[PDB]
Design a protein around this ligand. Structure first.
Ligand SMILES: [Mg+2]
Ligand code: NA
Ligand code: NA
Length: 195
Protein backbone atom coordinates (compact mmCIF):
# COMPACT_ATOMS: atom_id res chain seq x y z
CA UNK A 1 0.00 0.00 0.00
CA UNK A 2 1.39 3.36 -1.14
CA UNK A 3 0.70 6.63 0.61
CA UNK A 4 1.81 10.25 0.45
CA UNK A 5 1.62 12.85 3.22
CA UNK A 6 1.07 16.60 2.92
CA UNK A 7 1.19 19.32 5.54
CA UNK A 8 1.78 16.60 8.11
CA UNK A 9 4.64 15.75 10.47
CA UNK A 10 5.01 11.97 10.32
CA UNK A 11 6.32 10.78 13.66
CA UNK A 12 9.03 8.19 14.24
CA UNK A 13 6.51 5.65 15.62
CA UNK A 14 4.31 6.21 12.58
CA UNK A 15 7.22 5.59 10.22
CA UNK A 16 8.04 2.40 12.15
CA UNK A 17 4.42 1.24 11.92
CA UNK A 18 4.43 1.93 8.19
CA UNK A 19 7.66 0.00 7.65
CA UNK A 20 6.50 -3.04 9.66
CA UNK A 21 3.00 -3.29 8.20
CA UNK A 22 3.49 -3.28 4.44
CA UNK A 23 2.94 0.43 3.78
CA UNK A 24 5.28 2.66 1.82
CA UNK A 25 5.56 6.45 1.77
CA UNK A 26 6.10 7.97 -1.68
CA UNK A 27 7.65 11.37 -2.25
CA UNK A 28 5.12 12.24 -4.98
CA UNK A 29 1.50 11.54 -5.84
CA UNK A 30 1.11 9.21 -8.83
CA UNK A 31 -1.51 6.84 -10.20
CA UNK A 32 0.02 4.19 -7.91
CA UNK A 33 -0.78 6.19 -4.73
CA UNK A 34 -3.54 4.59 -2.66
CA UNK A 35 -4.21 7.52 -0.35
CA UNK A 36 -2.83 10.88 0.84
CA UNK A 37 -2.75 11.81 4.52
CA UNK A 38 -3.33 15.51 5.12
CA UNK A 39 -2.61 17.69 8.11
CA UNK A 40 -5.57 18.61 10.28
CA UNK A 41 -7.89 21.46 9.33
CA UNK A 42 -7.81 24.13 8.15
CA UNK A 43 -7.15 22.38 4.85
CA UNK A 44 -4.18 23.72 2.95
CA UNK A 45 -4.45 23.65 -0.84
CA UNK A 46 -1.04 22.11 -1.41
CA UNK A 47 0.31 20.75 -4.69
CA UNK A 48 0.00 17.18 -3.40
CA UNK A 49 -3.64 17.79 -2.40
CA UNK A 50 -4.45 19.22 -5.83
CA UNK A 51 -2.77 16.33 -7.65
CA UNK A 52 -4.55 13.80 -5.47
CA UNK A 53 -7.88 15.47 -6.15
CA UNK A 54 -7.24 15.61 -9.89
CA UNK A 55 -6.20 11.92 -9.98
CA UNK A 56 -9.07 10.57 -7.89
CA UNK A 57 -6.95 9.61 -4.87
CA UNK A 58 -8.65 9.53 -1.46
CA UNK A 59 -7.58 11.97 1.24
CA UNK A 60 -7.22 10.65 4.79
CA UNK A 61 -7.17 12.27 8.21
CA UNK A 62 -4.09 12.52 10.42
CA UNK A 63 -5.90 10.36 12.99
CA UNK A 64 -5.66 7.27 10.79
CA UNK A 65 -2.10 6.26 11.65
CA UNK A 66 -2.63 6.93 15.36
CA UNK A 67 -5.63 4.61 15.37
CA UNK A 68 -3.68 2.00 13.45
CA UNK A 69 -1.00 2.09 16.16
CA UNK A 70 -3.55 2.01 18.99
CA UNK A 71 -5.29 -1.00 17.39
CA UNK A 72 -2.13 -2.76 16.24
CA UNK A 73 -3.68 -3.22 12.81
CA UNK A 74 -3.83 -1.65 9.36
CA UNK A 75 -7.32 -0.17 9.56
CA UNK A 76 -9.48 0.62 6.51
CA UNK A 77 -8.38 4.07 5.42
CA UNK A 78 -11.76 4.60 3.81
CA UNK A 79 -13.14 4.92 7.36
CA UNK A 80 -10.83 7.90 7.93
CA UNK A 81 -11.65 10.13 4.98
CA UNK A 82 -10.61 13.74 5.44
CA UNK A 83 -13.31 16.22 6.45
CA UNK A 84 -13.32 20.03 6.40
CA UNK A 85 -16.73 21.61 5.87
CA UNK A 86 -15.21 25.08 6.26
CA UNK A 87 -12.96 24.56 3.23
CA UNK A 88 -15.82 23.04 1.25
CA UNK A 89 -17.91 26.18 1.78
CA UNK A 90 -14.96 28.49 1.09
CA UNK A 91 -13.98 26.91 -2.25
CA UNK A 92 -17.34 25.50 -3.33
CA UNK A 93 -16.46 21.85 -3.61
CA UNK A 94 -16.95 18.55 -1.78
CA UNK A 95 -14.12 16.42 -0.42
CA UNK A 96 -16.13 13.20 -0.85
CA UNK A 97 -16.31 13.97 -4.62
CA UNK A 98 -13.52 11.48 -5.35
CA UNK A 99 -12.91 10.71 -9.03
CA UNK A 100 -10.48 11.51 -11.85
CA UNK A 101 -11.10 15.06 -13.05
CA UNK A 102 -12.15 15.57 -16.66
CA UNK A 103 -12.56 19.35 -16.86
CA UNK A 104 -9.14 19.92 -18.50
CA UNK A 105 -9.28 16.86 -20.78
CA UNK A 106 -8.75 18.01 -24.34
CA UNK A 107 -8.20 21.61 -23.28
CA UNK A 108 -5.39 23.80 -24.61
CA UNK A 109 -3.91 26.35 -22.25
CA UNK A 110 -1.64 29.32 -22.95
CA UNK A 111 0.21 30.76 -19.93
CA UNK A 112 1.55 34.26 -20.55
CA UNK A 113 5.23 35.18 -20.42
CA UNK A 114 4.62 37.33 -17.35
CA UNK A 115 3.30 34.33 -15.42
CA UNK A 116 6.04 32.02 -16.70
CA UNK A 117 8.80 34.43 -15.72
CA UNK A 118 7.30 35.40 -12.35
CA UNK A 119 6.74 31.76 -11.37
CA UNK A 120 10.09 30.35 -12.52
CA UNK A 121 11.06 27.36 -10.39
CA UNK A 122 8.69 25.46 -8.16
CA UNK A 123 5.53 27.49 -8.79
CA UNK A 124 5.43 27.17 -12.59
CA UNK A 125 6.56 23.54 -12.28
CA UNK A 126 3.54 22.84 -10.10
CA UNK A 127 1.15 24.63 -12.47
CA UNK A 128 2.41 22.66 -15.48
CA UNK A 129 2.22 19.43 -13.46
CA UNK A 130 -1.39 19.90 -12.35
CA UNK A 131 -2.43 20.84 -15.89
CA UNK A 132 -0.61 18.05 -17.67
CA UNK A 133 -1.68 15.47 -15.06
CA UNK A 134 -5.26 16.56 -15.77
CA UNK A 135 -4.93 16.01 -19.54
CA UNK A 136 -4.34 19.60 -20.68
CA UNK A 137 -2.12 20.60 -23.56
CA UNK A 138 0.22 23.51 -22.84
CA UNK A 139 0.64 25.89 -25.78
CA UNK A 140 3.97 27.65 -26.08
CA UNK A 141 3.39 29.91 -29.10
CA UNK A 142 1.19 32.93 -28.41
CA UNK A 143 0.11 32.89 -32.09
CA UNK A 144 -1.38 29.42 -31.57
CA UNK A 145 -3.15 30.73 -28.47
CA UNK A 146 -5.53 32.46 -30.89
CA UNK A 147 -7.06 29.08 -31.77
CA UNK A 148 -10.68 28.50 -30.78
CA UNK A 149 -11.35 27.66 -27.12
CA UNK A 150 -7.76 28.15 -25.88
CA UNK A 151 -7.82 29.03 -22.20
CA UNK A 152 -5.43 31.94 -21.70
CA UNK A 153 -4.03 32.45 -18.21
CA UNK A 154 -2.62 35.92 -17.50
CA UNK A 155 -1.87 38.29 -14.63
CA UNK A 156 -4.44 41.06 -14.00
CA UNK A 157 -1.63 43.64 -13.98
CA UNK A 158 1.78 44.16 -15.55
CA UNK A 159 1.20 41.52 -18.26
CA UNK A 160 1.84 42.77 -21.80
CA UNK A 161 0.69 39.54 -23.48
CA UNK A 162 -2.51 39.40 -21.47
CA UNK A 163 -3.21 43.04 -22.25
CA UNK A 164 -2.57 42.58 -25.94
CA UNK A 165 -4.70 39.47 -26.23
CA UNK A 166 -7.57 41.08 -24.38
CA UNK A 167 -7.23 44.07 -26.77
CA UNK A 168 -7.90 41.75 -29.69
CA UNK A 169 -11.20 40.62 -28.10
CA UNK A 170 -10.01 37.38 -26.52
CA UNK A 171 -10.78 36.53 -22.91
CA UNK A 172 -7.93 36.01 -20.42
CA UNK A 173 -8.28 34.44 -17.00
CA UNK A 174 -6.66 34.52 -13.56
CA UNK A 175 -4.41 31.64 -12.56
CA UNK A 176 -6.76 30.83 -9.66
CA UNK A 177 -8.97 29.23 -12.34
CA UNK A 178 -6.84 26.09 -12.27
CA UNK A 179 -6.86 25.04 -8.60
CA UNK A 180 -10.55 25.83 -8.07
CA UNK A 181 -11.63 24.08 -11.28
CA UNK A 182 -9.77 20.94 -10.18
CA UNK A 183 -11.57 21.00 -6.83
CA UNK A 184 -14.97 21.48 -8.47
CA UNK A 185 -14.27 19.34 -11.59
CA UNK A 186 -15.85 22.27 -13.40
CA UNK A 187 -14.47 25.51 -14.92
CA UNK A 188 -16.55 28.55 -13.88
CA UNK A 189 -14.98 30.92 -16.39
CA UNK A 190 -16.77 34.12 -15.38
CA UNK A 191 -15.41 33.92 -11.82
CA UNK A 192 -11.86 34.24 -13.17
CA UNK A 193 -12.31 36.58 -16.15
CA UNK A 194 -9.88 39.49 -16.11
CA UNK A 195 -11.54 42.86 -16.71
MG1 LIG B 1 7.54 16.90 3.08
NA1 NA C 1 4.57 20.81 4.09
NA1 NA D 1 -10.89 43.06 -23.70
Amino acid sequence: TNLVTSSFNLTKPMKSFIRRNGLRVQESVTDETDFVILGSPPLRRTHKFLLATSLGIPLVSSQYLTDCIKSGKVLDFRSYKYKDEEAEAKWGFRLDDIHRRTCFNGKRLYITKAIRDSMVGDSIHGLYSILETSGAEIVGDIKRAQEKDTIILAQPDNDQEGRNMSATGLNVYKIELVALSILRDRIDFDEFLID
